[PDB]
Design a protein around this nucleic acid. Structure first.
Ligand SMILES: [Mg+2]
Ligand SMILES: [Mg+2]
Lengths: 47, 805
RNA sequence: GGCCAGGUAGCUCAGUCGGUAUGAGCGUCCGCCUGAAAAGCGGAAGGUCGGCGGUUCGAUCCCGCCCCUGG
């Protein structure tokens, strides 16, 4: 879409950075459970 | 190390002693190759054809030009009115295919180096092919560091005179350079004897014409050798350096303040060269300085303080011999591949210093209209030296014959050594050889042997196979690496050559701890990639890299292996001081050098991804699983003729529930199994990637001598079902059954693993097929059951097994 | 180091001086289809546009240094 109107009212980057920060947290959160469940999962008889 | 010259100039110096000598350029290159001179490239000049002649410009129109070619034409940067130029009129051809009221050619457009010929080079209208000498051939030679004397026409002409057995006239001799009068010193001179200078000569030339230019024959030879000709006094110093191998430099005599001094740089001085840049100096650098500023860097670069310009009327040339090591360490730091420095670091004949000076002073005055001052300052050390010959070398007369394996005709060694300039005397059957001053590389009998052999030609050396020494063949370990490679390839693995350079933070991808022993790597100062300077502690990163290349290019079902050594330092990179080369290092000095090195053991590793069994008419194939990595271990173990035991273990980058530590006896030898899923995702590897890595040096060599005795009596077949906790490995139960069953047990195989509610939770039932056989009798069923019950009891005590009820 | 054209999806490469890379071909996934496939048709996934900084609400695109290929 002037420098006006192309600034405030277009600074939804905070809305995108907040939606990202919610994804980056859950990505690190869900990655931690997978790595934890691997340490407690039933192993195989390697022999 | 390059040396470029035209054939005409080289043939001229050879023709002085052998008149009429002329050879095909292919023969010349072949002869130079046969005596040890790498001919990098042979460049013929031009060629032109048609109306390409010379002419003088008559008028300037600021650009139109009027050139008198018996005719008069007009043709449209670096030329003034009256200069002779090369003209190419529209007619026949031109080097490069470009067909040309014409064109004023340049040195690059003529395939020779716009080009301005000096006044008097030729008559307007002369055929430019002959004026420029296009029938010439420029030779590009690679000179080895032992033949610094070949960085000149003098050395190469002498070499050709040796090869063709010709009479040679040294261009630095007194008949080609008659000594100039010495009626007094030329300039006050002082030299610190600790500077390493061997000679320092000085002779001036007064009243030179600054409007005088170099003749065409002198400018053409400088250009065909790769040196841009600007003005005499510097054209003659480069011409003499090219002709005789002695580097020459000309100062402005009217720009030298006080006495000339040669000494080491005190602390961090600086100097502005002819180019015009301040260069940081070292306390071990030699320079020529005056009472005003620095005149030149010793045998490396001249300074603009005393450099001659276009206003110079009095020149003072300095013929000096500098330390080759001092010039080498100085030219490399400042990125100065100077023609003077490249020759000084490879030694320069110190006996021709005054002869090369007299050639410079005389040639400059003959073309620039000057006067040679009958004065010379010739410093030759303290005390003044008069014999620059290397020390004499004693060698048996038939020593070259023995080393060559050829019975040369008598007098061959003496003739060849005299050909290259050495004085040879006889004492019974022992020669005493004093090399010439321009051959400091000749220090030992081996150096003399090479001179005889290369001149006679290595082609005359017969091919005589030496007798076979009673060797022992391949070592046990070397045989094992072959068997391991053969067995893995026959099992469907493809060998790769692993790179020893670790990927960018590969261990960070594996999630290894900061204190992981694999992270203690040996780093590289100058890697090919600045993000991969670490050496390989494990073969897996290289195999996993090669796996990604295959999968990313459509080959998704892969199994690769590699048998190569790794690098494992036990401390920070420690250095060992220099041990004298003139003697053998003691066994304690050897052990000190080994301990300062990483351990570096031989490893075998493998990676697998995709389908382990390809699909086909039999069925859809089987994807790779951890058991395929364990089977690779058993393939390597069978090839090594050892028994391995696998135990569950946690060890990144492997999956902790799908990882086995491999043991030979009680020694850990590596790991195997499936890779950690987080490591796979963070590395871009295929899902379910499996890997193996064993230390072959930790696996002892074994050569068992079995003595089987086949029992002719029948066997008894029995099966036993045992219930154990889920964590009990099946091999542990098999070992306990074997230990209890005794010597009657001939074979045991697991064929059933059963779980379910019939068996307790977190328990499993294993059924083994047993084969009993006595060596001296037929068994009753009770005999076999007795051995089975003892095996059941042993499994109960060792793994808590319960007989299936 | 100098000077330069480049680095863009799994492969090979186009394309853009501020909000869409409508990226292409092939590779990957789903559907129709087949006993199961492939093609075909239809529908999707996937790029921190070389790294690190600088400017703006916002940079693959503009500034600086640097990593590696042709140079
Ligand atoms: Mg030699
Ligand atoms: Mg489909």
């Amino acid at each position: 879409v002037k420098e006006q109107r192309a600034e405030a009212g277009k600074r939804v980057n905070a809305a995108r950075n907040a939606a990202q920060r919610s994804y980056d947290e859950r990505l690190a959160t869900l990655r931690a459970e997978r790595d934890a469940a691997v340490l407690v999962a039933e192993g195989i008889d390697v022999t | 190390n390059a040396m470029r010259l035209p054939y005409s100039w080289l043939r001229e110096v050879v023709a002085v002693g052998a008149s009429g000598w002329d050879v095909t350029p292919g023969e010349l290159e072949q002869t130079l190759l046969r005596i040890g001179h790498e001919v990098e490239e042979v460049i013929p000049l031009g060629p032109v054809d048609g109306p390409v002649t010379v002419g003088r410009v008559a008028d300037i129109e600021e650009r139109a030009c009027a050139v008198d070619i018996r005719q008069y034409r007009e043709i449209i940067t670096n030329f003034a009115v009256g200069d002779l130029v090369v003209v190419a009129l529209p007619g026949a051809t031109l080097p490069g295919g470009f067909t040309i009221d014409g064109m004023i050619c340049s040195a690059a457009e003529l395939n020779l180096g716009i080009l301005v010929l000096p006044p008097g080079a030729a008559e307007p209208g002369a055929d430019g092919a002959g004026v420029l000498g296009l029938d010439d051939v420029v030779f590009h030679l690679a000179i080895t560091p032992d033949r610094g004397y070949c960085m000149s026409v003098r050395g190469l002409a002498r070499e050709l005179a040796c090869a063709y057995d010709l009479d040679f006239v040294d261009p630095a001799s007194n008949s080609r350079v008659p000594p100039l009068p010495i009626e007094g010193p030329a300039w006050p001179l002082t030299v610190q004897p600790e500077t390493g200078v061997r000679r320092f000569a000085l002779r001036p030339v007064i009243g030179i014409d600054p409007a005088a230019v170099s003749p065409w024959w002198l400018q053409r030879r400088l250009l065909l050798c790769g040196i841009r000709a600007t003005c005499p006094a510097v054209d003659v110093t480069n011409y003499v350096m090219l002709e005789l191998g002695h580097p020459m430099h000309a100062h402005d005599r009217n720009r030298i303040s006080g006495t000339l001094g040669v000494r080491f740089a005190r602390s961090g001085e600086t100097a502005v060269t002819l180019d015009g840049i301040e260069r940081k100096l070292d306390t071990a650098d030699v320079l020529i300085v005056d009472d005003a500023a620095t005149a030149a860097i010793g045998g490396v670069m001249g300074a603009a303080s005393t450099e001659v310009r276009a206003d110079s009327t009095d020149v003072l040339l300095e013929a000096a011999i500098w330390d080759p090591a001092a010039v080498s360490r100085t030219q490399r730091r400042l990125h100065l591949p100077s023609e003077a420095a490249r020759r000084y670091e490879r030694t320069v004949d110190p006996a021709i210093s005054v002869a090369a000076l007299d050639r410079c002073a005389r040639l400059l005055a003959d073309i620039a209209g000057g006067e040679v001052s009958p004065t010379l300052t010739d410093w030759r050390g303290d005390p003044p030296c008069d014999d620059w010959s290397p020390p004499p070398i004693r060698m048996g007369v038939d020593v070259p014959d023995r080393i060559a394996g050829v019975a040369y005709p008598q007098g061959t060694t003496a003739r060849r050594l005299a050909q290259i300039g050495a004085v040879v005397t006889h004492d019974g059957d022992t020669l005493t050889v004093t090399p010439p001053s321009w051959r400091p590389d000749l220090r030992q009998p081996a150096d003399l042997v090479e001179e005889v052999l290369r001149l006679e030609g290595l082609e005359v050396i017969p091919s005589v196979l030496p007798p076979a020494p009673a060797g022992r063949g391949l070592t046990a370990g070397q045989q094992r690496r072959r068997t391991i490679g053969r067995s893995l390839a026959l099992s469907g693995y493809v060998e790769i050559l692993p790179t020893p350079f670790l990927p960018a933070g590969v261990f960070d991808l594996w999630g290894l701890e900061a204190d992981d022993s694999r992270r203690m790597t040996t780093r590289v100062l100058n890697p090919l990639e600045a993000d991969r300077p670490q050496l390989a502690t494990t073969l897996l990163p290289a195999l996993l890299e090669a796996l990604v290349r295959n999968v990313s290019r459509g080959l998704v079902d892969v199994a690769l292996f590699a048998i190569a050594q790794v690098v494992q330092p036990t401390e920070q990179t420690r250095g060992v001081g220099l041990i004298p080369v003139d003697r053998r290092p003691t066994d304690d000095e050897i052990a000190m050098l080994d301990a300062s090195l990483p351990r570096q053991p031989q490893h075998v590793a493998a990676v697998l991804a995709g389908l382990r069994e390809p699909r086909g008419p039999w069925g859809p194939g089987r994807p790779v699983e951890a058991a395929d990595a364990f089977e690779a271990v058993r393939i390597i173990a069978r090839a090594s003729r050892v028994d391995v035991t696998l135990r569950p273990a946690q060890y990144l980058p492997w999956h902790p529930g799908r990882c086995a530590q491999v043991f030979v006896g009680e020694s850990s030898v590596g790991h195997a199994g499936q890779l950690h899923p987080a490591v796979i995702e963070r590395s871009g590897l295929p899902k379910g990637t499996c890997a193996v890595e064993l230390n072959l040096d930790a696996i002892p060599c074994s050569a068992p001598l079995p003595a089987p005795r086949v029992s002719p009596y029948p066997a008894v077949f029995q099966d036993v079902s045992l219930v154990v906790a889920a964590d009990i490995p099946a091999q542990a139960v098999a070992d306990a059954v074997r230990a209890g069953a005794g010597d009657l047990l001939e074979d045991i195989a697991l064929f059933d693993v059963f779980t379910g509610p019939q068996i307790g939770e977190h328990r499993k039932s294993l059924t083994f097929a047993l084969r009993f056989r006595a060596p001296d009798r037929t068994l009753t069923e009770d005999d076999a059951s007795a051995a089975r019950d003892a095996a059941v009891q042993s499994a109960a005590e060792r793994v808590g097994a319960v007989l299936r009820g």
